A = this chain, B = another copy of it.
Amino acid sequence: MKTVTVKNLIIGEGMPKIIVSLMGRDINSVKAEALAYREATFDILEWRVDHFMDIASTQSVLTAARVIRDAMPDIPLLFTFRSAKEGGEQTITTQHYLTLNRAAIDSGLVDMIDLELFTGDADVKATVDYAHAHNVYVVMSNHDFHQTPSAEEMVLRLRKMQALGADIPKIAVMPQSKHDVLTLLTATLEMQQHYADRPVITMSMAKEGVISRLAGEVFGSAATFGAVKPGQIAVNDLRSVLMILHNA
């Protein structure tokens, strides 16, 4: 199990790491959230770039990145444009997605980038190599906000992410039943004990899936998503459960 050490956070060891997601529609609103999030205790800051309106301007995007980086200079910073297709806030062409992600990478302002598995294999390969050339780590991601694929399909996707050079494969799926939550946990475990040689993040969405945000140390998810301000768990509550589990 290779691990990813960012700043001094070690992902894939110990208790799962708590990610919070910062959403801002403009520079002022990113800055407001950056100030408010800075009071809070968590492990990784995800900047959800798809909420930012001025995405046509790479310079504006990089100004927003710099504000966040400067607000929390020591926090692992993850740059994420989530496509509408996978539950994001707006549409983007594959060429512009690549422009932003490459600009984030070569800016030096971010520690990790999110890259969607189903962007296209040539574009994903290329972008993984560029990130690695610039010492940025890749969280490769797939989300299904409608339903849960079979255990075997989910494992196939995570394994393809490893094959593509992902530092941290990630998958998030929507339960339609409690059975679906067991399927996601079963997929996580198979990955952990038969395939994973790097950290993997998995989650079952919504109220039904909350247990998957708590059970990561047990079945093999290396990070979880927490809220500063269904399924969303406040970071101090989240950390409480993770410690209690860890020390049992």
Residues in A lying within 8 Å of B, measured CB to CB: 178-179, 181-182, 185-186, 189, 192-193, 207-208, 210-211, 214-215, 218-219, 230-233, 237, 240-241, 244-245, 248
A110 to chain B, nearest CB (A): 30
Specify which of B211, B219, B241 is in contact with A240 (CB 8 Å cutoff). B241
Inside 8 A of A207's CB, which chain B residues have their CB?
Answer: 248
Inside 8 A of A245's CB, which chain B residues have their CB?
Answer: 210-211, 214
A11 to B245, CA, bound (A): 25
- Which residue from chain B places its CB closest to the CB of A248 in the assembled complex? B210
A241 to B182, CA, bound (A): 19
A78 to B12, CA, bound (A): 43
Q: State whether B214 touches A231 (Cβ < 8 A).
A: no
A240 to B64, CA, bound (A): 38
Inside 8 A of A244's CB, which chain B residues have their CB?
Answer: 233, 237, 240-241
A232 to B248, CA, bound (A): 6
Copies of the protein in its oligomer: 2
- Chain A binding site: helix, strand, loop or mixed by DSSP? helix
Q: State whether A189 touches B193 (Cβ < 8 A).
A: no
A179 to chain B, nearest CB (A): 6
A218 to B212, CA, bound (A): 11
Q: State whether A230 touches B214 (Cβ < 8 A).
A: no
Which 6 pairs show the lowest CB-CB distances between chains A and B? Answer: A210-B248, A237-B244, A211-B218, A211-B215, A241-B241, A178-B189
Specify which of B185, B186, B211, B248 is in contact with A233 (CB 8 Å cutoff). B248
What are 15 pairs between A and B in contact, CB < 8 Å? A178-B193, A178-B219, A182-B182, A182-B185, A182-B186, A207-B248, A210-B218, A210-B245, A210-B248, A211-B215, A214-B215, A231-B248, A237-B244, A241-B241, A241-B244
A57 to B220, CA, bound (A): 51
Inside 8 A of A233's CB, which chain B residues have their CB?
Answer: 244, 248
A100 to B39, CA, bound (A): 59
A24 to B2, CA, bound (A): 48
A193 to B214, CA, bound (A): 23
Inside 8 A of A192's CB, which chain B residues have their CB?
Answer: 178
A192 to B208, CA, bound (A): 15
A96 to B178, CA, bound (A): 43
A244 to B182, CA, bound (A): 20
Q: State whether B178 touches A218 (Cβ < 8 A).
A: yes
A231 to B237, CA, bound (A): 20
